[PDB]
Structures are given as structure tokens and as C-alpha cells.
Enzyme design. Structure first.
Site, PDB file in Angstrom:
ATOM      1  CG  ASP C  47      -1.820   1.291   1.193  1.00  0.00           C
ATOM      2  OD1 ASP C  47      -2.644   1.463   0.268  1.00  0.00           O
ATOM      3  OD2 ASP C  47      -1.659   2.111   2.122  1.00  0.00           O
ATOM      4  CB  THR C  80      -1.841   9.911   0.853  1.00  0.00           C
ATOM      5  OG1 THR C  80      -2.289   8.633   0.387  1.00  0.00           O
ATOM      6  CG2 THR C  80      -2.732  10.369   1.994  1.00  0.00           C
ATOM      7  CB  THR C  81      -0.885   7.782  -3.882  1.00  0.00           C
ATOM      8  OG1 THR C  81      -2.278   7.794  -4.217  1.00  0.00           O
ATOM      9  CG2 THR C  81      -0.639   6.709  -2.839  1.00  0.00           C
ATOM     10  CG  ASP C 381      -9.907   8.134   4.170  1.00  0.00           C
ATOM     11  OD1 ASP C 381      -9.252   9.008   4.771  1.00  0.00           O
ATOM     12  OD2 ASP C 381      -9.376   7.226   3.497  1.00  0.00           O
TER      13      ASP C 381
END
Lengths: 201, 65, 513, 72, 129, 200
Positions: C47, C80-81, C381
Site C-alpha cells: 500500500d 496521499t499518493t 476518510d
């Protein structure tokens, strides 16, 4: 490893580690191949130096073995997990894994709704499980001609040292009923190992 | 592992023995001579006797045992 | 010099090189990693998102990356990515420009010109949704939640995040309900179903033992006074050369503290937050044993975190010595509650606490910490997407396809800019299309077909339509059941617009010595 | 033709497991379909003759791992 | 950890040790006799007609020799004799069979021959015993 | 203490408890065990090793019945069920086309390794194992049926398909529906990592 050497951390970034995985994947499943089936060879396997183990069970082999890659690692679970299931299918699950993980990524890489690709290897299991639920064509102890007699007789033909399977077809019938213990979902099936059984020279 | 066997193996033996004995030909009788042996003590040991010489200082051999 | 030229390129070297394999982004794509570290290890990693936070990359342009990743989390809670997936996007365009020879500071403000109009084109593709609206809050969080590790509990998690917000939210339109306001408090035991949404301040601290006060009329506060006794806070003249001198102070020690804890409970204290400071003791182990006899909730050397929330939420003030009684500057608390569910966990709940209209405490429970953390990360989230709705009103797409939607456009916007920057911004304006393929990329063989056509697909979907990255096929990504609040993606540009532009500034290198 | 040898050929396999009349790639149209009614038209004899030579050299040369030479 | 070995390579390594062990003691065993003399690294000589005495005093190779000491024991465990017979006898069947038979390609009747070669002993012995 | 009295609570009730010494081994043989049904099958053999010989032969007459009593639905043990499924699933892939003709066929081609390796493990000439099975496997016979109009069976200690349709060395539908998914898993199992990195 193969290809780019530029970054450690088992990051070969794609097909290299992927192949370095299929390498490791094709590396681990090899013992199982020679160990597959009762005709699978029996592997004397050194534990330390003079410490050894003679085992034809890949799962048992795996348990002594250690996992040097995630490819080495992910199988030694699922194999020992299918071993954890029963122990029937230990060697089974092992091998096919090494082929599909060069097969799996090749499609799932291309995205275009990336989710559902490996389900092509799943729906097939479904497609198989259904058919696998459909096979009385071979392996019937559900009923034989004498049922559990001949079912055991052919099973005493499956393991046969002699004309055993004459009384011994009946013993296995006697055995399952010899054991009476609470078994759940409603099973008249009662554990076959606990059967009181005595040896007479 | 490392194994010397049969005909070629016994050669070093008979090569040693016959090779080791021929030095004692300097000995055994007055036309032979006392053989000088020296040790870590540096002692000059003059014997035409085989035993004295033999059991003190020599070259490593399987036949030497 | 060549060093300023090369080090930028060398900075462009490392950071970009990382950001590429940093894109398998999302998907069930690419093969799992152990990691043998720089100084060595075996680190089994998965991940890239957490991996980004895990990422130690050490190099002048590598350190901004880990930052860049972590910010979009605290900026959004998502993407985030995604901030890094457009980072190497910026890192490419610079080259061709510097390969074209274009000045980096002229290239620098191009990033602004890209960020300036880029968010508006994002604002154009933004589908504005109400920030206080249960449904938009539910639905937006639901897309995150349904993509989170619990899509089941999400049904219970979203209204919590919806109600966590709407309580904490400023009424009607608000940029509000921070992740500081929300206090996410784990509780061992319970269930994810028993994850509890408390409007008020629940301090995650473990209450001393049990059978203590669960009753009403708490007084909670951080008390920096200590409980005196012989050989505690109080003077003694007696050195021990003997066993009796050892025992005498103790007999007077535990008794006098036993009458001090009364003054504490006499104050009305069903809780105390003990100063992390001690002298020999502060509140002794018998003292807490004595305070708990009086049903005063005590946690010795309380974690600094619950110290702040009670001072942040309730407005707690320092308190006078127990021999001075108190200032009653213990924060206002009407309930000292220790909940035990699954028979597990000790949880202080201060309810009726002074609260601003904010500080929801979501109590996160589960049969296991792993059970706890699933929803806890999921409801986050749920919180953040809603919080992203609150902080900014919109539903755009997730997955990075709307970046291509900005890309077709911002190209022409440069083409209209008609400047040297029109070459600078445009070189990136298309170069942002790279992500949807690079998400897909890291898995298999027979590669090529999807990659090029993705940006082509959306390009053929033009400005209004394009391919959904997650669900596949050409449909406008902004409303899919692949969605984000626009706050998620715009910050990714902002963050990357700058840290990347910061590289354009670097001339040569120094090392502080 | 701008296609996916991976994806397309199976589609034509599918469209020969679904169709199976002429269904096949058109580099001309850049699509896949019945090529006879995509009008892509060649005699079958050349294809017959393709077959005749196809396996021929194939089966031929594979019969030689044993090769002799005499430059001398 | 995980290690893999394969094919003739180990089975040839199986062939080597026991067979090479089977050399001197076969000449030693019986009235016709020799001596297996171990060379200690110091030149120390140990000569016996029991290779299993010599085998231990130095490295025992894993593939053949690690099992042969035990089938050496097992025979001497059972009747009280025969360390020196089984090793050369197993070295016999080990030597010429597999490769030849594996060049004739099968593990099966090889293993199966041991059975039916074993009982012909049991068969022709007790008749002429 | 042996000083303890005895009461009938520890007494077992039976039609008669009669002592039968057979084989020169006396046993306590309880005729009419009342509070449950009970049986024990003693094994007459030359020695107890000869009894060890058949007893183990009996155990795989047991678990198979048991596993059948576990699941009435079964399969023949071994990759012979693949040999049917594989070309069928490659066919089940065919009309899918596109991605999907690849996967399900790229799936089913990877099935074939198990029995053929198991075949040559018995030195069965894995060409044979496929020659026999997937011959019988057809569109003529796509049919497991309940019966043999084709032979989908593979004997494992044989490595070769035999005619045993009852044999105790097979396996039910239990372990086989499992081994499929676990096999599909390792295709996925390695793939979950997102991105990639390196640590210092």
C-alpha cells in the site's frame, strides 16, 4: 537479481521483481512437483547439517523451509493454509500458483476497470467449483453397489496389501458406526480415527 | 570426501617406508655410522641405533607411526 | 554552474525516479515487497500510501517527497499518493523546458500559472455539493468508505462522520470540523458497530482500575498539585540506619495522603488529570489507590494528548494545592464515565463538558485493535471527505482521471497564454495526463494498449467526458461512484506546485556545517 | 491497425465463438469484423498454398537436427 | 531455509559415497581382507575393517553416507553384526542401477525391483538354507 | 485411599460381561453396551505388523467415506477434474474473448501442471494422462454426469487414470473447491502492494 540493480529493498520495480517473483514462485513449487501425489518422491531434507528430515509432504517440507521472497512467502502460507484446511491439496495448491502470477498481472496491469481481471481466475474457480460440485462420475463413497462396503472395498482396493477388503470392506462400515459421538449439522458421520481397533497376530 | 584408495594409495606408504628406511642404511654395524639426531633441545644425538633415532625426531608419515 | 544545472537535474533525478514506481497508485496492482533497507532490513511493505509515509527516501529532492505525501493527508485525508503522482508529472515538464533551456524561475511562476488556472478548471469540473447536507456528507464519505477497508460498517461510520461534522460544523456553510476538533479515540473491546460517536470530549485515557465513578457530577482537570506525606512532599529529619525509621514515615505517609484524596473528592472530583511532574512521588501509587477509594478517576502521568483536549475543549486551568483545597479550575465535567464493552477497555468519557460547538469524540471499538483500526481508518476518510466537503464544497472524481480533464484544457489555456510560460505550463499541462496509466502500470506483460489510449479516451471524451479510472469505460468521472471533494485534488497541485518549484530554485548545493 | 493483439484476437476468437463467419481484423477500417463483408478479399488457393508450404518447411526442417556440411 | 536439489546430481552423489565406502570394506569383509586406514590431519593412522569406524572419524557426506551409518547400525542393531555387509550390498544396487535404469528412465521399477530382488533372496535362501 | 467404599454408580450395565480370551489376548468385551452403541473390530493377521499393514489400508477406506459423509458431492482426486475443466474453461474463456478469453484460458492452461507432474511422478508419461482424460473430455462429453460416459478419474498412488470410481485415495468436493481459490489467491496474493519504495 535481474535487470535494474539500482535500488535495494526488493524493489526491482515491475517485471524484474515480478519475474524474480515468478522465479522464486517457480523456485518453491519445484519440491512439491517431485513430491506431488503418493508417487511423489520422499525428500530427505537437512535441518542443519547432520540434522535432516525425510518428507514427501511439500507443506511439511515448506514448514522446515523459510521464505526468501514474498513470492516464496505468499505460497508457503496458501500451501500451508490449504494444508491448514485439511492436508488434502497441500501439493495441489502449490504448483499452479507459480504459473498464474505471470498470467495474472499481464491482464490486470492493463487496467480498463482494473478491478475484475483476476476474477477471470476466480469465476473460473466458481465455474470449476460448480462442476467440482457436479462430479460423482468418479470417486463415489456416497453410494456404491455394496455402498460403504464396496466403497471401502474399492477403498481397500485403493489401499490394498492382499485380499483385504473382504472383511475389511465391512470393518470400515463397522468402523464408522463403531464410533458414535456428537457430530454437528446432523452428521451420522462419526470420526473414523477414534474407532476402537485391535491388532491380532 | 577426500579418499585415497587401492594401488596408488599404498604407494606413498611404501614410498615413505622404503624411503624412510634407506637413511638407516648409514647404521647397523661399524661400517655404518652413528646417525646424528637433533631435537628442539638442539641435542646432537649420536646413535647407530634405530629405536633412539626413530622415536624422537622424524618427518611426518603414516608409516612413521 | 554545472552543479546548479546538474543538482536540479540530480534533484529532478532522484525525486522523479521515486515518484514513478511510487505509482502503482491504488489498484490491486504490482507485486508485494519486502524491503531490505539502505542500512539494511527486511521490511515487508504494501500500500504505497502508508509506504509513502513509511518512505525514508534520503536525498535533497527525496525529502520533500515524503513531506509532499504527508501533507495531502492532513490537507485532505485523501489523495496521499495523488499529490506525488502529479509530482513526477511536474518533474518531467521542467526538463524539456530546461532542455529547451527555459529559465527555471520563469519555469517557476509557470507552476503558479498552472496552479492558478488549474484549480479553476478543477473548480469548473467541480460539481458543488452542500457541505452541511447529510446526503452529500453521506454520499461523499460513502465513496471513500465503500473504498475503505470496511464498506459494511461504513453504513454506520458515515452518519457518525456526518453527525460528527454537523455537530462540530459551523451552521449552514462552514469551513470547519478539523481533525483536531474530531478526537478519534480507540477503545479496546466493543465492536465496530459499538464504535461510538460522542459529541463532547471523550479522553481516550485508561481510567484507573474499575468499579470507580461512573456517576454524574465529575470534576475533571489537569491538577499540578501533589499529595504530600512523610517521604512524599513533606520534610523528614530521619535517616534510616534501622528498620523502624523506615516504617514510621510510611505509617504516617499513607494515612495523610488518604485524607488528602478526600479533599480531592471533597472538591467534587470524580476525575483528576495528574501532572506528569513528580517530586519524589506527586500522586503516589497508594495515593491513586486512595483517590480511587474516593472514586476519583486518575491516570498517573497522564498522556500529554488528553491533557490538551481537556484544556482545548473544556478550557481547563491549573488548580491549587490540595492542602489549599482547589481553585475549582478543574474543567467543567458533569460525567465521569468509564465504559467497559466486550468487557475490554477503560475509557474516560467527559460529557456535559464545556465544548465550543466542536470537538466530536468518535469512540472507536472493536473485537480487536485491527478490528478497531479498520473502521477507525475508514471513518477517518468518512470524516475527511466530509471535512473536505466542509472545507470545500464540491464532488469531483477520484482516481486522477479529472487531471486529464484539466490537462486537455490547461494545454489550450497555455496556448491562449501565448507566453514563454505558455510553453512552460503547456509542457506540464499535458504531462499531467500520465497518472491513470501509471496507476495501472506496475503489474504485468503485454503492456501497451490501455496506457496511451486512456488519455486518448478522455481526450476523445474531450472536456466534458472521459474514462473512469477505477470503474473503466468512458463516462464523466466527476460523478461516478468514483468521486472526491475538490479540496482533495486542488491541494495536490498546490503542494506539488511549490516543493517542485522549490527545486527550480536550488543552485548548486551546501551542507550546513 | 492500432489494436491489441492481446485483446482483439480473442475478440475475434470470441467473434468466431460468437460469430465465426469471417469475423476478423481490418487494418483498413481499423476495426474487426467479417472480412468478406469487410470486403477484404483474397483467393483461398494462396491460403491453401499457404497451408501447403506452412507445415511443409515447418515439418521439413524440424526433421533435421542432424546436419552435415563439407566446405572441404 | 528453502533449498532445492535435483535429478541425477544428488542421486549420483548418492552413488558416490556409499559405493566409494563399499570399496575397501568389501575387500576387508570375509576371510579375504584388507584395512581401511584413516589419515588424521596429524598423520594419525586408523586402520580397521569397519568403515563405519573410519567414516565417523572424518566428515560423513550427507547424500549416501549419512543414511549408510544408520543402515550400518540398523543391521548391527538387529542381529549384532553386519555394518560392513549392508553398506557394500546397498552400494552394489546403488551403483549400477539408477543411472542405467534412469537412462532407461524410471524411478518406479527400480524401487520395485528391490522388493522382488529382495524376496528372491528370501525365496532361494530358505530353499537352499 | 483404597479404604473407599464402592457404589453401583461406577458399574456399567450390560446384557452380560463375559471374558473372551482370543489370540492368547484376553479382552473385556462388553456385550450390549447400554448407554450408547459400540463396536471394535480386531484385526487377525500374521503379526501386528501384518496388522499394521491392513490397519493403515483401512484408514484411507475411512476418511474418504468420512469426507464423503462430510460432503456427498465429490470429485475424483487429482488434476483430472482440471483436464475436463481446463479445456472446458479454456472453452468457457473462448466466447468471452478480449481480456476474458485470456484470463479463464490463461487460468485453465495453468491447471494442467498438477496431474501431469503427478503422472511423471509415477512415470506415467504425462502425454498419456492428458491423452486419456481430455480425449474422453469433449463437447460430446462435457458431461461429468454422475457416471462414466467419459473418465474424469485419476488414481493418485497410480499416477494414471484407472477404472476405480469408488476408490478411497480420491478426495471429495471439499478440498478441491478450496485448492482452486487458494490457487487463484496467489495470483492476487502478491499483487496488493500499491506503489513501491526503498528505505534507509
Amino acid at each position: 537479481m535481474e535487470g535494474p540493480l539500482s535500488v535495494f529493498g526488493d524493489r526491482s520495480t515491475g517485471e524484474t521483481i515480478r519475474s524474480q517473483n515468478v522465479m522464486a514462485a517457480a523456485s518453491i513449487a519445484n519440491i512439491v512437483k517431485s513430491s506431488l501425489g503418493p508417487v511423489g518422491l520422499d525428500k530427505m531434507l537437512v535441518d542443519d547439517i547432520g540434522d535432516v528430515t525425510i518428507t514427501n509432504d511439500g507443506a511439511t517440507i515448506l514448514k522446515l523451509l523459510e521464505v526468501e521472497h514474498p513470492a516464496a512467502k505468499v505460497l508457503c502460507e496458501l500451501a500451508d493454509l490449504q494444508d491448514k484446511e485439511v492436508g488434502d491439496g497441500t501439493t495441489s495448491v502449490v504448483i499452479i500458483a507459480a504459473e498464474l502470477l505471470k498470467n495474472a498481472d499481464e491482464l490486470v496491469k492493463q487496467k480498463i476497470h482494473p478491478t475484475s481481471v483476476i476474477s477471470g481466475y476466480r469465476l473460473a474457480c466458481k465455474e470449476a467449483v460448480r462442476y467440482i460440485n457436479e462430479n460423482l462420475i468418479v470417486n463415489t463413497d456416497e453410494l456404491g453397489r455394496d455402498c460403504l462396503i464396496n466403497a471401502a472395498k474399492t477403498s481397500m482396493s485403493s489401499k490394498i496389501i492382499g485380499i483385504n477388503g473382504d472383511f475389511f470392506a465391512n470393518m470400515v462400515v463397522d468402523a464408522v458406526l463403531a464410533i458414535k459421538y456428537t457430530d454437528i449439522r446432523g452428521q451420522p458421520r462419526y470420526p473414523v480415527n477414534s474407532v476402537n481397533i485391535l491388532k491380532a497376530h | 570426501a577426500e579418499v585415497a584408495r587401492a594401488q596408488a594409495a599404498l604407494a606413498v606408504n611404501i614410498s615413505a617406508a622404503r624411503g624412510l628406511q634407506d637413511v638407516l642404511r648409514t647404521n647397523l654395524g661399524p661400517k655404518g655410522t652413528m646417525k646424528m639426531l637433533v631435537s628442539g633441545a638442539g641435542d646432537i644425538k649420536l646413535t647407530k641405533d634405530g629405536n633412539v633415532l626413530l622415536h624422537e625426531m622424524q618427518i611426518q608419515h603414516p608409516t612413521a607411526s | 554552474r554545472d552543479k546548479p544545472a546538474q543538482i536540479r537535474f540530480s534533484n529532478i533525478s532522484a525525486a522523479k525516479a521515486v515518484a514513478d514506481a511510487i505509482r502503482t497508485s491504488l489498484g490491486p496492482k504490482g507485486m508485494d515487497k519486502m524491503i531490505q533497507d539502505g542500512k539494511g532490513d527486511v521490511t515487508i511493505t504494501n500500500d504505497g500510501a502508508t509506504i509513502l509515509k513509511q518512505m525514508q527516501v534520503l536525498h535533497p529532492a527525496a525529502r520533500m517527497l515524503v513531506e509532499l505525501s504527508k501533507a495531502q493527508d492532513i490537507e485532505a485525508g485523501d489523495g496521499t499518493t495523488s499529490v506525488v503522482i502529479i509530482a513526477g508529472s511536474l518533474l518531467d515538464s521542467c526538463t524539456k523546458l530546461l532542455q529547451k533551456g527555459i529559465h527555471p524561475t520563469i519555469i517557476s511562476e509557470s507552476f503558479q500559472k498552472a496552479l492558478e488556472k488549474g484549480i479553476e478548471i478543477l473548480t469548473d469540473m467541480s460539481r458543488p455539493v452542500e457541505l452541511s447536507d447529510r446526503e452529500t456528507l453521506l454520499n461523499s464519505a460513502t465513496t471513500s468508505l465503500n473504498s475503505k477497508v470496511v464498506s459494511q460498517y461504513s453504513s454506520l461510520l458515515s452518519p457518525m462522520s456526518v453527525n460528527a461534522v454537523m455537530k462540530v460544523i459551523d451552521p449552514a456553510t462552514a469551513t470547519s470540523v478539523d481533525l483536531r476538533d474530531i478526537k478519534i479515540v480507540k477503545k479496546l473491546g466493543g465492536t465496530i458497530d459499538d464504535c461510538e460517536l460522542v459529541e463532547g470530549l471523550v479522553l481516550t485515557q485508561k481510567v484507573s482500575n474499575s468499579g470507580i465513578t461512573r456517576v454524574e457530577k465529575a470534576k475533571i482537570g489537569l491538577i499540578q498539585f501533589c499529595l504530600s506525606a512523610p517521604k512524599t512532599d513533606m520534610d523528614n529529619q530521619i535517616v534510616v540506619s534501622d528498620y523502624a525509621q523506615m516504617d514510621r514515615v510510611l505509617r504516617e505517609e499513607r494515612a495523610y495522603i488518604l485524607n488528602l484524596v478526600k479533599q480531592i473528592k471533597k472538591t467534587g472530583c470524580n476525575v483528576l488529570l495528574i501532572q506528569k511532574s513528580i517530586l519524589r512521588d506527586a500522586l503516589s501509587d497508594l495515593a491513586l489507590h486512595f483517590l480511587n477509594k474516593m472514586k476519583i478517576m486518575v491516570i498517573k502521568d497522564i498522556e500529554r494528548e488528553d491533557i490538551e483536549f481537556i484544556c482545548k475543549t473544556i478550557g481547563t486551568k491549573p488548580v491549587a494545592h490540595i492542602d489549599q483545597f482547589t481553585a475549582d479550575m478543574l474543567g467543567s465535567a458533569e460525567l465521569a464515565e468509564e465504559v467497559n464493552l466486550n468487557g475490554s477497555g477503560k475509557l474516560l468519557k467527559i460529557t456535559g463538558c464545556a465544548s465550543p460547538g466542536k470537538t466530536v469524540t468518535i469512540v472507536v471499538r472493536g473485537s480487536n485493535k485491527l478490528v478497531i483500526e479498520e473502521a477507525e481508518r475508514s471513518i477517518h476518510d468518512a470524516l475527511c471527505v466530509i471535512r473536505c466537503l466542509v472545507k470545500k464544497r464540491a464532488l469531483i472524481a477520484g482516481g486522477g482521471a479529472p487531471e486529464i480533464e484539466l490537462a486537455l484544457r490547461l494545454t489550450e489555456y497555455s496556448r491562449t497564454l501565448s507566453g514563454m510560460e505558455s510553453y512552460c505550463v503547456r509542457a506540464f499541462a499535458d504531462a499531467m495526463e500520465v497518472i491513470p496509466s501509471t496507476l495501472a502500470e506496475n503489474a504485468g506483460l503485454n503492456p501497451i494498449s490501455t496506457v496511451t489510449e486512456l488519455r486518448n479516451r478522455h481526450a476523445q471524451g474531450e472536456k466534458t467526458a472521459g474514462i473512469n479510472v477505477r470503474k473503466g469505460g468512458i463516462s464523466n468521472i466527476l460523478e461516478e461512484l468514483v468521486v472526491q471533494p475538490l479540496l482533495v485534488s486542488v491541494s495536490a497541485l498546490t503542494l506539488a506546485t511549490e516543493t517542485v518549484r522549490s527545486i527550480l530554485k536550488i543552485d548548486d548545493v551546501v551542507n550546513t556545517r | 491497425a492500432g489494436f491489441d493483439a492481446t485483446n482483439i484476437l480473442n475478440k475475434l476468437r470470441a467473434r468466431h465463438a460468437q460469430g465465426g463467419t469471417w469475423y476478423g481484423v481490418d487494418i483498413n477500417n481499423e476495426d474487426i469484423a467479417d472480412n468478406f463483408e469487410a470486403f477484404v478479399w483474397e483467393p483461398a488457393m494462396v491460403r491453401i498454398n499457404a497451408l501447403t508450404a506452412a507445415s511443409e518447411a515447418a515439418c521439413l526442417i524440424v526433421s533435421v537436427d542432424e546436419t552435415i556440411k563439407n566446405p572441404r | 531455509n528453502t533449498k532445492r536439489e535435483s535429478g541425477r546430481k544428488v542421486q549420483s552423489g548418492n552413488i558416490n559415497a556409499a559405493k566409494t565406502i563399499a570399496d575397501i570394506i568389501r575387500t576387508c569383509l570375509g576371510p579375504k581382507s584388507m584395512m581401511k586406514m584413516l589419515l588424521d590431519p596429524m598423520g594419525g593412522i586408523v586402520m580397521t575393517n569397519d568403515g563405519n569406524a573410519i567414516l565417523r572419524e572424518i566428515q560423513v557426506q550427507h547424500p549416501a553416507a549419512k543414511s549408510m551409518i544408520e543402515i550400518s547400525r540398523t543391521q548391527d542393531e538387529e542381529v549384532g553384526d553386519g555394518t560392513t555387509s549392508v553398506i557394500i550390498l546397498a552400494g552394489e544396487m546403488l551403483s549400477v542401477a539408477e543411472h542405467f535404469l534412469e537412462q532407461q528412465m524410471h524411478p518406479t521399477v527400480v524401487i520395485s525391483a528391490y522388493r522382488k530382488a529382495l524376496d528372491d533372496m528370501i525365496s532361494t535362501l530358505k530353499k537352499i538354507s | 485411599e483404597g479404604e473407599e467404599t464402592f457404589e453401583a454408580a461406577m458399574l456399567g450395565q450390560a446384557e452380560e460381561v463375559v471374558q473372551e480370551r482370543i489370540c492368547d489376548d484376553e479382552l473385556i468385551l462388553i456385550k450390549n453396551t447400554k448407554a450408547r452403541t459400540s463396536a471394535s473390530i480386531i484385526l487377525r493377521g500374521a503379526n501386528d505388523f501384518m496388522c499394521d499393514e491392513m490397519e493403515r489400508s483401512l484408514h484411507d477406506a475411512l476418511c474418504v467415506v468420512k469426507r464423503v459423509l462430510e460432503s456427498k458431492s465429490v470429485v475424483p482426486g487429482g488434476g483430472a477434474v482440471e483436464a475436463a475443466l481446463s479445456i472446458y474453461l479454456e472453452n468457457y474463456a473462448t466466447s468471452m474473448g478480449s481480456r476474458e478469453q485470456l484470463a479463464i484460458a490463461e487460468f485453465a492452461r495453468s491447471l494442467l501442471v498438477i496431474p501431469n507432474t503427478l503422472a511423471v511422478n509415477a512415470a506415467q508419461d504425462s502425454t498419456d494422462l492428458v491423452a486419456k482424460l481430455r480425449a474422453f473430455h469433449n463437447e460430446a462429453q462435457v458431461n461429468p454426469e454422475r457416471k462414466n460416459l467419459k473418465w474424469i478419474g485419476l488414481d493418485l498412488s497410480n499416477g494414471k487414470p484407472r477404472d476405480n470410481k469408488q476408490a478411497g485415495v480420491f478426495e471429495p468436493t471439499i478440498v478441491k473447491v478450496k485448492s482452486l481459490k487458494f490457487a487463484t489467491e496467489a495470483a492476487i496474493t502478491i499483487l496488493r502492494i500499491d506503489d513501491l519504495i526503498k528505505l534507509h
